[PDB]
Design an enzyme around this catalytic site. Sequence first.
Site, PDB file in Angstrom:
ATOM      1  CG  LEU D  40      -2.070  -0.978   1.313  1.00 41.18           C
ATOM      2  CD1 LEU D  40      -2.724  -0.895   2.682  1.00 41.18           C
ATOM      3  CD2 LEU D  40      -3.084  -0.707   0.218  1.00 41.18           C
ATOM      4  CG  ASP D  41       0.547   6.071   1.165  1.00 40.16           C
ATOM      5  OD1 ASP D  41       1.744   6.216   0.847  1.00 40.16           O
ATOM      6  OD2 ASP D  41      -0.176   7.024   1.525  1.00 40.16           O
ATOM      7  CB  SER D  42       1.528   2.264   5.359  1.00 40.41           C
ATOM      8  OG  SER D  42       0.411   1.393   5.371  1.00 40.41           O
TER       9      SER D  42
END
Lengths: 74, 57, 167, 86, 141, 165, 114, 56, 458, 90, 107
Positions: D40-42
Amino acid sequence: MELPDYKQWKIEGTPLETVQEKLAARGLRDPWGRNEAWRYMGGFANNVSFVGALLKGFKWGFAAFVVAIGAEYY
Amino acid sequence: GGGAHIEPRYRQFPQLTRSQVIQAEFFSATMWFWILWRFWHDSDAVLGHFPYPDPSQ
Amino acid sequence: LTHQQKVLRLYKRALRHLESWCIHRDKYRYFACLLRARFDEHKNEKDMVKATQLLREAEEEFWHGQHPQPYIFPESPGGTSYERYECYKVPEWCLDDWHPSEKAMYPDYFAKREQWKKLRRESWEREVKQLQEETPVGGPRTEALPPARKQGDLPPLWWHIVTRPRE
Amino acid sequence: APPLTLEGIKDRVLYVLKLYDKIDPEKLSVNSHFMKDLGLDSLDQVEIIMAMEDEFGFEIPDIDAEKLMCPQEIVDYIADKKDVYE
Amino acid sequence: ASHITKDMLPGPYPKTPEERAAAAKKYNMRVEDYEPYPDDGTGYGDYPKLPDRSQQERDPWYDWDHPDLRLNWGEPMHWDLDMYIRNRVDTSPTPVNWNLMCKHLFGFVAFMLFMFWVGETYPAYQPVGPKQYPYNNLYLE
Amino acid sequence: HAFFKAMLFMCSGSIIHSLNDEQDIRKMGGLFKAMPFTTTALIVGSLALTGMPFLTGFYSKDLIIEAANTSYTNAWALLMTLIATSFTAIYSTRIIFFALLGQPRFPTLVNINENNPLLINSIKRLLIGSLFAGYIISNNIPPTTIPQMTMPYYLKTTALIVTIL
Amino acid sequence: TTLDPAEYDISSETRKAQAERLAIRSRLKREYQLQYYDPSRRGVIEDPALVRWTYARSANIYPNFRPNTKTSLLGALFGIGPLVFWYYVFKTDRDRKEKLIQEGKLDRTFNISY
Amino acid sequence: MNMFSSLSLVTLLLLTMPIMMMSFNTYKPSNYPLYVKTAISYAFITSMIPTMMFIH
Amino acid sequence: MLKYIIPTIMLMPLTWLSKNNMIWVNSTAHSLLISFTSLLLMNQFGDNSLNFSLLFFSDSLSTPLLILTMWLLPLMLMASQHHLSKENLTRKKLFITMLISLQLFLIMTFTAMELILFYILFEATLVPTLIIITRWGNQTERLNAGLYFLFYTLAGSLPLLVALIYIQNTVGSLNFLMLQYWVQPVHNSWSNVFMWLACMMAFMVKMPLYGLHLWLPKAHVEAPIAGSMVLAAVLLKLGGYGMLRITLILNPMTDFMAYPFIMLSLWGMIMTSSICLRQTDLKSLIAYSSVSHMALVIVAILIQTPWSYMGATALMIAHGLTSSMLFCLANSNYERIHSRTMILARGLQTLLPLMATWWLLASLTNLALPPTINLIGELFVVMSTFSWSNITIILMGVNMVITALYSLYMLIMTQRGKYTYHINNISPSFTRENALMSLHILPLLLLTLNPKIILGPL
Amino acid sequence: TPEEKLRLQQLRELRRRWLKDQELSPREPVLPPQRVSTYRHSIFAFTHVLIPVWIIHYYLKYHVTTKPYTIVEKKPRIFPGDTILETGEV
Amino acid sequence: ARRYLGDASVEPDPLRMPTFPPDYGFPERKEREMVATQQEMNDAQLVLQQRDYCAHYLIRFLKCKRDSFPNFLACKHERHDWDYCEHLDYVKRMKEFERERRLLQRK
């Protein structure tokens, strides 16, 4: 030089890695498990023991303890 | 560097020099031979005891 | 500090303070996705207080139970033997006054010394010329153009270009 | 006392690609840019070096995130920090 | 040798926007929480209009601080607020103000009531009453 | 006591250089990762620090806790000295259970080395001098005081079992 | 215990146009780095943040000072304050100590020093 | 009996010699810890001689 | 002094009589030669007493104190040449001649044979010091500090003349200290307070109490070329010793009112050293060390009965050599960085390794490491005022605590690094910079072998 | 980030380029220069200890007869085994 | 200490005793006391808390420590006999609270 060539570890023992089996009802699943199991497997299941480690196996535990005793003794 | 007589590793267990283990196993034998005078012969308290000195009359 | 990378600087330490708590190696590793599972609850939604309650209640259970003397990665801002290499400390350019018969040693290093100074002594006709132009009035951080459009020399020359090596 | 060269840093970074089960040994060697298969983004920005957080892991400050997109740009300044190759 | 804005003057209400910054950039446009109003405790000659005191405090935090240096070693341009007590400051701990340290010595303060007694090995407490008689009861015979 | 920790600092000083730095009780592993000699020297002095079954300072440790047997003390003093002896036992196995027991966990490039005879000449003199210290000193000394030599039932030998628990 | 120290708070969007306070310190750093790099300096930079730190602490307290308060007249609880107390102690000794020295004896035969 | 402390002041005087020779009186081919390690190495055996004289 | 004054005046028509730049080597050559002759007839014996020649000398018999006064003109000329060599030779000849002219009157002082010969020579100074303060300083606050140096010393010393002329026509004549066999005692009255008080207060203005020390961090802060009269002004402060000549006799029985001088100078001792740990000017850091353990002698003189005069004499020339060198450590390391701000001189201890020992062996004499001339001085004062009252070990013990944390704070500010700046500071502490930094510890630890030379009568 | 793609590739052409110059041992550039030029255990050991014991004894035997107190030795601590009984073991 | 009478010489350090100071002494069985020779106890360089009972057996015991100089044990069984001198002395003293608990009861 290049000793960690891949497809080497490939989990077969390392009973620590049965905890990834434990989360089968949870599921993560694949990535990743071969990090902590770097040197968990191999000949590293030697893993020194209980009081016999501080006994060092009780190896020479009574070795010359009875071998000296004894003569003369008349 | 100059001499690589002990090589670095990738967790393959570099071993001993096959003489260090001799001195290692020699100084477990010298202490468990030294349990000699711990038991033979030395007891818990070599003093003698009192047999409950109640009849003092 | 943007809201995009506000969780991320907390995300690096959320696992980092965890591994100082474990005793096994798999004890951390069995808890890996388990710690990720609570972090994967709110995946994709708004940026307002609708999703700030991920963070506004992350004060509890992170600061509550935060790293009882954790691992410190000894070469760091904190931790032992971090800035220890200081008896040497590399005093670069202390070679001005010698009264030679002490400049006898290293005849080639003193030969190479005068060669590199031409970039240092002569770059101000070029680097400082565009420096009044590229910086408009008083703008933010003062890095130059990253090639300086022909040859970056440097602007950081030479104190950041020939700086102190560690040993 | 032990020195180091630059042929070891090219392998360890490349090996932990193969150690991750999310990434196959079919991606590019030095530049897959981590968006080829990001997500993901993180956990695709800091988790991608969370394996080297244990291995190399010299506390890896806040600037190290967005430079690490280019997977060769990771290899660039590790040599700058730990007093490395010539 | 700089004479214009050498130091402060008898403030701190001499048109505070003109002070920071003519020079001494404590505030940007006199709304920065460090406009030179802070004469806290006027009547004291200490800290006049003063691009100076009661500004936020307790540390140069002595860590990364990485524009380049930013804290105490590497000397940024204009950030001196109050010093000579910030040589080795710290920060908040994991607990706060539960003074168990005086309570830690309070355990022996209760055991100061055990300093009143003695520690004789033979015999025990001996629940008899006035039949212990620790020194003497009767004569030689 | 002077033969204990100048051994033991120097014993663990071979370990900190062996990982080139951690000096942490975390991230260590087990005992024998090509560490034969100094782990054998660790289990002597840390067994001396248990409370001396027959080791070096048995003639210093046991004779004082059984000099506080018959005494006019605080009666909270023996409730503070002898309890501290039990806490000295978990000092021992703690460095065993983190540095000398577990699975090998630490960052890689295992750069261990132990074969410099400067260190091997160092330890082999002091460990021999450790064992036979008190059995020469206390065996050859003028006595200056009258010993206790009385220790009746259920009050006598539990100071070892203080260490056993 | 000294102090709290307020390591997390809120924002977004309380006065969002507060930015370019860095433009002050980037201006200073662009002024400083252009000052610090030069091929022939041989000497320090002035940096008058130090100059305004000494001269506003060494001088410029007494031209500032007016005794308009009583917290600067507080010093009689601090200047002449404890100096009163040390006189009270030292004349109780050397008087109670004196009478015992004359009326009766306290020291022994082997007191040659003194 | 006159050699009871005559050999003991040898111990308290010999250790000053690797500071006297540290003031450059034609120093050794360098190896300077070896000079001090061997300086103690003879100072121990001198000190033990009056210890046996005491226990008699 | 038969003729010590007579050769040292002959130094004066040698300087202007010389050639060009030879004027430095010609003066320092002959000035060292007096140090044999100064020792030569003096240090004789010794049991009651050495009256020397005439009405001009009692030979400074039981208090030597004068050999140290003669080191300095061949100690300051090698120190002053750092930033003086830009002026004219016509003024460079001046600054050597008034410095000799300061040593002339100090030589007939400390011996002086009288009490009225003392005063006119006690006040014969302060004219050649004031010329070194006003001319030859740095930027301003010279001129008010030139006036604070007066008007404390001169306001107090004029009621000496009212009292010393009063004695000269009351009881015989004061002209000799050995016609002081007939001394009537001084009882408790309302006029005999002031006779004691006016005769004492002019000595307090030079060796300061906690009050009226307000001129001492004025002249030493703003100060000549390289400590050049600052070395002289530390001797001149301890050259107000004459309370040892007066108060031993000549109103001997007034301890009744010693107490406002005890408590003011015993509590002030524990505070005026505590008030310096936040200094930012380096030469003002030392200037308050000179307040504190100089004021320990003021509670060592007024408390009589030796085992204190054993120590109160040894403390006058304890920091006669210590506090001189600390000013010389700060007169150096200012030629290279042009500020006396203690913040700025960091990044050191790598650049100048040879002078690291000169910092420590200075600051190891305030910690004072008992076999020196320092803790043979304090530990006689400690064992003296213990026998006054037992409670005085507390304040004097905390005096020993804070000055331990105080001296190291000046050392440890140089043990840092990375230096951030400073294309200057190259000069690797040249042969002169270590020579005039030596000859301080070289007699200081030498006299610790047989310090029977440093003792009163006693 | 698009900006530092041009940056830091020339920094290795400046930092490591200087660090290319920094590793410097051509033809052993310590000159030093000028000039020139186990078993014994004979002259090293005899010079150290044997000479001061000759010295420090000489200020000791010539010293007990000069100073009115020498070393201040105690008594012999003798048991009844010279001219007395034992007497038991009763 | 069994006598409370006067002391002729004013010598402190309680060698000025009746003969020999015990810990308590005697008290009942035996009501007597006695020890070694005080002229030998001062002739032997021996500290206090060593002029108690079993001293004459110890004065002959520790003599063999020097009379057998390069030895490991002069007499180990006599050390068990001096302890048997000590343990019989001490259990004789242990009968205080066997009596004092009962002799302080009514009759």
